[PDB]
Paper text:
In Gram-negative bacteria, N-terminal lipidation is a signal for protein trafficking from the inner membrane (IM) to the outer membrane (OM). The IM complex LolCDE extracts lipoproteins from the membrane and moves them to the chaperone LolA. The LolA-lipoprotein complex crosses the periplasm after which the lipoprotein is anchored to the OM. In γ-proteobacteria anchoring is assisted by the receptor LolB, while a corresponding protein has not been identified in other phyla.
The structure of LolA-PG was solved using single anomalous dispersion (SAD) on selenomethionine (SeMet) labelled protein whereas the structure of LolA-VC was determined with molecular replacement using a model obtained from Alphafold22. LolA from both P. gingivalis and V. cholerae consist of a large curved β-sheet comprising twelve β-strands. The electron density for both LolA structures is generally good, but weaker in some loops, especially between strands β8 and β9 of LolA-VC which constitutes part of the opening of the binding cleft. LolA-VC is structurally very similar to other known LolA proteins, especially those from γ-proteobacteria. An Arg-Pro motif located on the turn between β2 and β3 is conserved in γ-proteobacterial LolA (Arg59, Pro60 in LolA-VC). A pairwise structural alignment to compare LolA-VC and LolA-PG, using the structural alignment tool in the protein data bank (rcsb.org), resulted in an r.m.s.d. of 2.8 Å calculated on 176 aa and a sequence identity of 18%. An electrostatic surface representation of LolA-VC and LolB-VC indeed show that the residues lining the LolA-VC cleft is mainly negatively charged whereas LolB-VC has a ring of positively charged residues around the opening. We used isothermal titration calorimetry (ITC) to investigate if the recombinant proteins LolA-VC and LolB-VC can interact without the presence of lipoprotein as has been reported for E. coli. The measurements showed that the two proteins indeed interact, with a dissociation constant (Kd) measured to 30.2 µM. We investigated this hypothesis experimentally by ITC and could conclude that LolA from both V. cholerae and P. gingivalis bind polymyxin B. LolA-PG shows higher affinity for polymyxin with a Kd of 14 µM compared with 56 µM for LolA-VC.
Residue numbers in the entry:
A (entry chain B): 17 to 198
B (entry chain A): -2 to 0, 17 to 198
Write the structure that this text describes.
């Protein structure tokens, strides 16, 4: 099955580190933004998404707190890691079992897996994960209902679980802290 | 598969007499960041026929009917004419129109899965390496032009129609008011 193929491929490694490039395309197909950064991901639930361009910022979850640090505005915002998917979709790359995909219909074409929300009332868009038969994640795409798509491609993949330390974010000096856990 | 790279690459290209598709381009610097994007559409009929219509970065048209290669630029409103048998001199895209082993005579070819890497056997070539990604069913997914210093111009195909375009698609007619730069020599 497609869900089982996706999950078994994600399960081949407990984590990875990589650089990424990003391209955002309008519904018309026009490039709106290009960006880049780095990622560390350990399964389940742990992700450290570091954006270099165009908006330098850090998003990091230890499975309990989701932190958002933006250096330009000297701000740290706190969220429940329970509500990660509401805030960011990158947490999908940290899944590793078929029951994690209950909200979606899954389809496979080669290494490309498309996850479509089951309900039709959805405002959420579809997702795509490109992952090799050896379990190497090649890309991730977020497609809005109106056709706008943000595309992430991974390179320089280190197919090893990052240390737990990488996700234990400490609030730094010189920032305001906005608690959004309640 | 990988023990006969040119035969496999040839057999896969021969699976369809042509295709049409949209394409998107990314150029990556030697340090791996995106420095340029583009898009357009392509029609290919095998052998030798191609129509590569670019929208970005520069809007322009390249089309060969096997005899004449036309390059039309709408900003300068000029079309240059070339001999089609020298198409490779002007564009690497003609490589997607091949379908037999003797067409890869100038290259060492490596197959790793669906990715075929074409390397000029001698280092002198101003051109660097080429990469064609094509399924076992013959569907071209992408094409890369790689420079020696690491820069890569990467093309990805989408909305593919695995069907031969009509021969009429490649019978370019020079539009009224366009200047003609004849290089057929
Ligand atoms: Zn994170
Ligand atoms: Zn709240
Ligand atoms: Zn053969
Ligand atoms: Zn055009
Ligand atoms: Zn132009
Ligand atoms: Zn060899
Ligand atoms: Zn005109």
């Amino acid at each position: 099955a497609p869900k089982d193929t996706l999950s078994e491929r994600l399960a081949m490694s407990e984590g990875f580190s990589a650089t990424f490039n990003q391209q955002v395309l309008s519904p018309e197909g026009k490039v709106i933004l290009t960006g880049n950064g780095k990622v560390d991901i350990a399964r389940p639930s742990l992700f450290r998404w570091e954006t270099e361009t165009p908006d330098e910022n850090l998003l990091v979850s230890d499975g309990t707190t989701l932190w958002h640090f933006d250096p330009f505005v000297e701000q740290v915002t706190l969220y429940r890691a329970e509500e990660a998917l509401e805030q960011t979709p990158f947490v999908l790359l940290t899944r590793n079992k078929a029951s994690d995909w209950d909200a979606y219909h899954v389809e496979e074409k080669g290494d490309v897996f498309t996850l479509t929300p089951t309900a039709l009332d959805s405002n959420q868009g579809r997702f795509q994960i490109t992952i090799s038969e050896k379990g190497v994640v090649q890309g991730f795409k977020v497609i809005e209902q109106d056709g706008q798509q943000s595309e992430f491609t991974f390179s320089k993949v280190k197919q090893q679980k990052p240390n737990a330390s990488v996700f234990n974010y400490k609030v730094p000096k010189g920032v305001e802290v906005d608690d959004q856990r309640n």
